Design a protein around this ligand. Structure first.
Ligand SMILES: O=C1O[C@H]([C@@H](O)CO)C(=O)C1=O
Length: 212
């Protein structure tokens, strides 16, 4: 009963948000609404089937909406907004077009067996195509307010800053004048500052996920 968020924690530490920007989203879309919840944090499987059977895949991250189950962190950006009593945040702007290319390409940046040095030459132009229109709107990666593109990307940018920072601390130039200031906003609000992981426990959970 109530919002029972059932989520992968850090590797080794079932009390902190670690290597999953995917679970950090679920906190973000409810903290933007200010709606209260509880976070059942799982280290890899250390909580039994009652915390996993909420997923149609058996995979965390997933949610109960007062025991009424909902599937994974990438369809939660619709289904946790659809079933909410507080205002839905699922609304896709024009920024969802470029943001849907950034969404997997920044996961592949953290799995760059295929070179990141060649990948980054597309990521700078993906960031420019987003940033060139975001600098007209001002504050958030979905435009004037937080909606689905911030829900797709916001903790994944902080996970890139932390986990890519461990081996290739890739700078955002001031020409990306929304992106470079929006990363500073992730250290603020309820919707981003509460979803911040402990940073060693992002890196030590991301290492085997360069492979897996
Ligand atoms: O979004 C992210 O990228 C990495 C890996 O998944 C890359 O495959 C990480 O661990 C986190 O979940």
């Amino acid at each position: 009963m109530a919002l029972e968020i059932c989520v992968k924690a850090a590797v080794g530490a079932p009390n902190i948000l670690g290597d999953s920007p995917f679970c950090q989203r679920v906190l973000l879309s409810l903290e933007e609404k200010k709606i209260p919840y509880k976070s059942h944090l799982i280290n890899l499987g250390d909580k039994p089937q009652w915390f996993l059977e909420i997923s149609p895949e058996g995979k965390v991250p997933v949610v109960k909406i007062d025991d009424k189950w909902v599937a994974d962190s990438d369809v939660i950006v619709g289904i946790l907004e659809e079933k909410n009593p507080e205002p839905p945040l699922a609304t896709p702007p024009e920024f969802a077009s470029v943001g849907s290319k950034i969404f997997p390409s920044f996961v592949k940046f953290l799995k760059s067996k295929d070179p990141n040095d060649g990948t980054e030459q597309a990521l700078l132009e993906e960031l420019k195509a987003l940033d060139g229109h975001l600098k007209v709107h001002g504050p958030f990666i979905a435009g004037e307010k937080i909606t689905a593109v911030d829900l797709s990307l916001a903790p994944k940018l902080y996970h890139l800053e932390v986990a890519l920072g461990h081996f290739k601390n890739w700078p955002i130039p001031d020409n990306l004048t929304h992106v470079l200031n929006y990363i500073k906003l992730l250290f603020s609000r309820e919707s981003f500052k509460k979803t911040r992981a402990a940073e060693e426990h992002v890196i030590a959970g991301w290492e085997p996920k360069v492979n897996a």
